[PDB]
């Protein structure tokens, strides 16, 4: 009872719709949406710029030809990815506040397959809650979840017997923490 | 009104569950699930081996270190991917027959954002319906959809103005058809 089960949060509009959207986000009309243009399109709902770190992660996830951006085709992937996350967010934002608190966060993660202690959720919030109020906004929710799934993979490469425990040498410790 | 809008069909069980599943599919206990072991685990519901071509596509989609297979971590990705597809399948298998007919297929694709003529769905079925009855099984549904999304990307790389039309030279024609 330790690790983090199945993955997480990742298609109804036609191409024209999404092509028109693409054209708007792509302000310089360069043909490619950059970290900066995407950010201005996204909304964390807290009136602050969408967590740039998350935008980066989202960009390099759908950008194939390392071009620090995405083209139309890949964008529809970004569109879907952001959309699936919003649905996840609203599902667990139970008191309809627009922010995910600790109780909701435990529900989100439990629902993703994670089996983490209560204490850990305080750490998780403090770590990714930029707002600094114990209420996680949309963008910090994605990032925290990406980092969890991104670190759970690494852990699994090491936990050969997937028992939730591993023995590491000082270096490996740093190497994997790096 | 031509192309194929947003993408398509791609996390509740804990790691232990999926680790135990992994161990069963991984019969040779090699630590890696191969195209062959996955196939035996999957079910197209028609009592025939799961479309090997689809299994391959699914394998190389989650296999990072080109090892003709997937490890535990990546498998949870395969698990989720197969699961999301089953849900899509059941959503559009409206008469609850276990197979997707033409009317259901039009609904599936329309729901994915595609705007294709009726005639095209006959072609699509004939092309991917191995059973050969006009009823598309789960595995042939995934493959057909993968190929559509896989070919729609390519088309979009060419249709600069995303108008649903392109001018191609004989070679490009073959090159992109190759
Ligand atoms: Ca641009
Ligand atoms: Ca809330
Ligand atoms: Ca609600
Ligand atoms: Ca271990
Ligand atoms: Ca094996
Ligand atoms: Ca049916
Ligand atoms: Ca049904
Ligand atoms: Ca064109």
Swiss-Prot record, chains A, B:
Gene Ontology annotations of biological process type: angiogenesis; apoptotic process; cellular response to heat; COPII vesicle coating; endoplasmic reticulum to Golgi vesicle-mediated transport; intracellular protein transport; negative regulation of phosphatidylinositol 3-kinase/protein kinase B signal transduction; negative regulation of TOR signaling
Presence of the UniProt keyword Calcium in the record: yes
Keyword Lyase: no
Disruption phenotype: No visible phenotype. Mice develop normally and display no obvious immune defect. T-cells retain susceptibility to apoptotic stimuli.
Main localization category: endoplasmic reticulum
Binding site for Ca(2+) 2: 93, 95, 97, 99, 104
Keywords (A to Z) from UniProt: Acetylation, Angiogenesis, Apoptosis, Calcium, Cytoplasm, Cytoplasmic vesicle, Endoplasmic reticulum, Endosome, Magnesium, Membrane, Metal-binding, Nucleus, Repeat
UniProt-annotated binding residues for Ca(2+) 1: 26, 28, 30, 32, 37
Cited SUPFAM superfamilies: EF-hand
Protein name: Programmed cell death protein 6
Species: Mus musculus
Lineage: Eukaryota, Metazoa, Chordata, Craniata, Vertebrata
Name of the gene encoding the protein in the UniProt record: Pdcd6
